[PDB]
């Protein structure tokens, strides 16, 4: 159905937030974690509204699971503060699990939780989530160090054994977001990162995304700003 795509700006604030969430589910299972994350985040933000309140709790359930699979971590602290707190509560255990680097705690909790998601059809994702905690874990270790031994990574991340630990760290590496190499017969991981934005052009690249996003705001703003006062003078100005 999604292929027709039409959605005007004169659409209501609740219909927009609903629309973003639904697409977000379809993407996430297809294995577009990257695209899925984006649409769902927009949905929470765009409608604060009042009919949205009821919907927002649903958005928060999905929000925490998708974002964790993509590779980024949020804080349990962020979630607790709003008064929609009541729906975030099982969710606090999951956020913490990924962040500490605790594979074993994260998947077991999620398998049992999987039931609730089935109504939504989010459940197929729950299986894939076992991987992401190990990946998040490796990411903090890779950036931090240069060469750190294989035994150290296995203890902190809460990997199954030292034999599990070499294979799994490797799978993350292929994608390239970790950007390392793992020495199996030498039992250390080496950081290919020697990263810095101290370079020639590179800081502009960082600045560029911010600058691009601003344009979308600027145009939307300009176009919109003039049209309501000119109308009221035209018809009933109150």
């Amino acid at each position: 159905l999604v292929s027709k795509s039409v959605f005007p700006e004169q659409a209501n604030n609740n219909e927009w937030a609903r629309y973003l969430y639904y697409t977000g589910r379809i993407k996430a299972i297809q294995l577009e974690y990257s695209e899925a994350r984006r649409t769902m985040t927009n949905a929470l933000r765009k409608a604060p509204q009042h009919t949205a309140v009821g919907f927002k709790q649903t958005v928060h359930k999905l929000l925490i699971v998708v974002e964790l699979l993509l590779g980024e971590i949020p804080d349990r602290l962020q979630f607790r503060q709003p008064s929609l707190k009541r729906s975030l509560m099982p969710y606090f255990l999951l956020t913490q699990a990924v962040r500490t680097g605790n594979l074993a705690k994260f998947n077991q909790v999620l398998d049992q939780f999987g039931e609730k998601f089935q109504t939504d059809g989010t459940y197929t994702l729950i299986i894939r989530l076992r991987h992401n905690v190990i990946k998040t874990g490796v990411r903090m270790i890779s950036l931090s160090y240069s060469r750190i031994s294989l035994a150290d990574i296995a203890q902190k991340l809460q990997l199954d054994s030292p034999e599990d630990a070499e294979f799994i760290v490797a799978k993350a590496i292929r994608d390239g977001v970790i950007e390392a190499s793992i020495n199996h017969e030498k039992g250390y991981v080496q950081s290919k990162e020697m990263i810095d934005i101290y370079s020639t052009r590179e800081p502009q690249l960082a600045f560029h995304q911010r600058i691009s996003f601003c344009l979308d705001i600027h145009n939307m703003s300009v176009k919109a700003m003039r049209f309501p006062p000119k109308s009221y003078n035209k018809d009933l100005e109150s």
């Binding site: 349990r76 602290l77 913490q96 962040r99 500490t100």
Partner: peptide
């Protein structure tokens, strides 16, 4: 882990005692 400070009070004490006896 919500706040590192509770855990850290035990960590610093424990870690020093073991480390000192051995190497330092």
């Amino acid at each position: 882990n919500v706040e590192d400070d509770f855990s850290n009070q035990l960590r610093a004490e424990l870690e020093k005692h073991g480390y000192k006896m051995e190497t330092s």
